[PDB]
Structure formats: C-alpha cells, structure tokens
Amino acid sequence: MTMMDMNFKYCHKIMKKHSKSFSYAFDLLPEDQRKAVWAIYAVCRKIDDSIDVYGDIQFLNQIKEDIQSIEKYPYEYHHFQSDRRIMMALQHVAQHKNIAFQSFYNLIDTVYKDQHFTMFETDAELFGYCYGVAGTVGEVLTPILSDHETHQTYDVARRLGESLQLINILRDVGEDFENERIYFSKQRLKQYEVDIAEVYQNGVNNHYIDLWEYYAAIAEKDFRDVMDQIKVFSIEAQPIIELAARIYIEILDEVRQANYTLHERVFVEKRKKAKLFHEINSKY
Ligand SMILES: O=C(O)c1ccccc1C(=O)NCc1c(Cl)cccc1Sc1ccc(Cl)cc1Cl
Ligand SMILES: [Mg+2]
Ligand SMILES: [Mg+2]
Numbered sequence: 309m310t311m312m313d314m315n316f317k318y319c320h321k322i323m324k325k326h327s328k329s330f331s332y333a334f335d336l337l338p339e340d341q342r343k344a345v346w347a348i349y350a351v352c353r354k355i356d357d358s359i360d361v362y363g364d365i366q367f368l369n370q371i372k373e374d375i376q377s378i379e380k381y382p383y384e385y386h387h388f389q390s391d392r393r394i395m396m397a398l399q400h401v402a403q404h405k406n407i408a409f410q411s412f413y414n415l416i417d418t419v420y421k422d423q424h425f426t427m428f429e430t431d432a433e434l435f436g437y438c439y440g441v442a443g444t445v446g447e448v449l450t451p452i453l454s455d456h457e458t459h460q461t462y463d464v465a466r467r468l469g470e471s472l473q474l475i476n477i478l479r480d481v482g483e484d485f486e487n488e489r490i491y492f493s494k495q496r497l498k499q500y501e502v503d504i505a506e507v508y509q510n511g512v513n514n515h516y517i518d519l520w521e522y523y524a525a526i527a528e529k530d531f532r533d534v535m536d537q538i539k540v541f542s543i544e545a546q547p548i549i550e551l552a553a554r555i556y557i558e559i560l561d562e563v564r565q566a567n568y569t570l571h572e573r574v575f576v577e578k579r580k581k582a583k584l585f586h587e588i589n590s591k592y
Contacts, residue, residue, distance in 0.1 A: 482570030
C-alpha cells in the first residue's frame with residue numbers, strides 16, 4: 309500500500325468508528341467515490357471533535373487554516389497544522405473534485421457558535437442549526453455523489469443532510485440532555501407543555517410523545533421528498549443514498565419500539581441493515 313492509501317484507510321477507520329450505518333452504506337460506493345467520502349467524513353468528524361482536544365478553539369483554528377491552504381493552493385505541498393493524514397487525503401480529493409469550501413467554513417462557524425450554545429427560540433433556528441452541521445456536509449458531498457451538479461442536486465443533498473440530523477436529534481434526546489444540550493425549540497416545547505429535564509427524571513408522557521412525533525413527521529416528509537428526487541444523483545450512488553436514508557428512517561421505529569427512552573441509544577441491527585439493502589437492491 310502507498311502512503312496515500314494509508315491516509316485514506318485512516319479516514320475510513322474514523323468513519324466506521326463513528327457510524328456503522330453510514331460506513332455500511334457508503335463503503336458500497338465504487339472505490340474512488342467511497343475514498344472521497346471517507347476523507348470528507350473524517351474532516352467533518354475532526355471539526356466536530358475539535359473543541360474537546362484542549363478545551364478551546366486552538367485545534368479548530370488549525371483545521372480551518374489547513375482547509376484554507378488547500379483551497380488557495382490545491383497543488384502545492386503543505387505542512388499541515390492539524391491532522392496530516394486527513395488533510396493530505398482531503399487535498400487529494402480537492403485536486404479531482406470541485407469542493408464547496410464555503411460549506412466547510414459554514415460547518416466550522418456552526419461549531420464555533422456551539423461553544424456559546426443557547427437553546428433555539430424557534431424551529432427556524434433549529435433548522436438553521438441542522439443546515440450548519442449537516443446540510444453543509446451534504447453540499448460538500450454533492451460533487452462526489454453526482455455527475456453533473458445543479459442547484460437541484462445541492463438542494464436535495466442539503467435536505468437529506470438536514471433530515472439525517474433531525475433523526476440524530478430524535479435518537480439522542482437523552483444523551484444530549486446529559487451533555488446539557490436540548491435541540492427542540494423553546495416555542496415547540498412550550499406549545500406541547502414539555503420539560504426535557506422533567507421527562508428525563510420521570511419518564512415519557514403523552515405530551516412528550518406528541519412533540520417527538522411532530523419532529524419525526526418532519527424528518528419523514530423530508531426523506532420522502534429526497535426519495536422522490538433520487539435521480540439527481542449518479543446511478544451508482546442512488547441505491548447507496550436510498551440505503552443510508554432507509555437505515556436512518558428505521559432508527560425512528562427503533563425509538564418507538566424502545567418507548568422513546570431517554571436512557572439508552574437505540575440502533576438498527578447490522579443484520580437488519582443487510583435486509584433493507586436486499587429490499588432496495590432488488591429494485592435496482
Ligand atoms: O452528526 C454529527 O454529530 C455531526 C455534527 C457536525 C458535523 C458532522 C457531524 C457528522 O458526524 N456527520 C456525518 C457525516 C460526515 Cl461527518 C461526513 C460525511 C457524511 C456524513 S453522514 C451524511 C450523509 C449525507 C448527508 Cl446529505 C449528510 C450527512 Cl451528515
Ligand atoms: Mg455533534
Ligand atoms: Mg447529536
């Protein structure tokens with residue numbers, strides 16, 4: 309294996325460690341496309357984890373400067389300040405694909421902002437957050453997952469990303485609360501008469517379930533709209549994206565089956581993923 313092979317294998321390790329679902333689906337892409345996804349995934353993960361390395365924005369600033377170096381001089385040799393393996397792989401991708409760098413900067417700005425997290429007043433603010441951490445990622449992936457990017461391709465990829473984030477939120481209510489984070493909006497919490505701290509201590513109730521299902525209906529409708537527009541993506545990526553999406557839709561049912569528990573993280577069995585892919589592939 310070459311040095312560059314090693315860099316990509318490391319990016320892959322980071323992705324599989326963080327998400328079995330996404331790795332399962334994306335590893336099914338053709339070699340050059342899946343490697344590009346690994347690199348983008350590893351960069352975004354490093355960004356999300358950056359603050360906790362020392363406890364401030366040092367490492368994140370270094371990541372940002374590395375990405376700016378690649379943007380400005382794609383073909384020059386760089387001595388990277390952050391994670392060399394990841395940045396070398398990213399640069400390799402950037403030489404072959406049109407990366408939306410401002411989308412990385414948007415993600416980084418969202419992470420900076422998260423240092424002074426205050427709850428969202430409205431769902432509009434929640435959805436803006438979903439764009440920031442996940443719609444941005446869809447934008448970056450767009451040139452990898454489509455042959456000819458148009459505004460529709462970015463729109464669909466952005467919507468998919470934001471739907472996946474909403475599902476993450478719906479899965480992780482309990483864990484996020486423990487980490488002093490609540491992502492449901494103050495408007496919606498008040499409208500449904502829900503107090504997460506109260507639910508965390510005393511268990512689910514009908515008001516909570518209604519609030520949860522309100523957001524779940526949103527994620528579900530977005531997912532359906534992505535599915536109706538699946539053809540914006542390359543023929544090879546279409547079944548993979550459908551699979552990633554369908555696995556995440558299944559997380560919602562796992563939550564329901566676990567009675568919306570705030571005290572464990574539910575998941576889709578690896579064997580159940582394989583089943584969904586069989587069902588999808590047949591159609592392809
Ligand atoms: O989920 C967090 O905790 C988080 C918080 C902030 C930043 C990143 C993440 C994060 O783990 N993102 C997962 C991810 C990365 Cl990282 C790389 C590539 C793909 C994906 S999954 C995907 C597939 C399709 C679309 Cl349209 C959008 C996405 Cl997100
Ligand atoms: Mg996160
Ligand atoms: Mg989360």
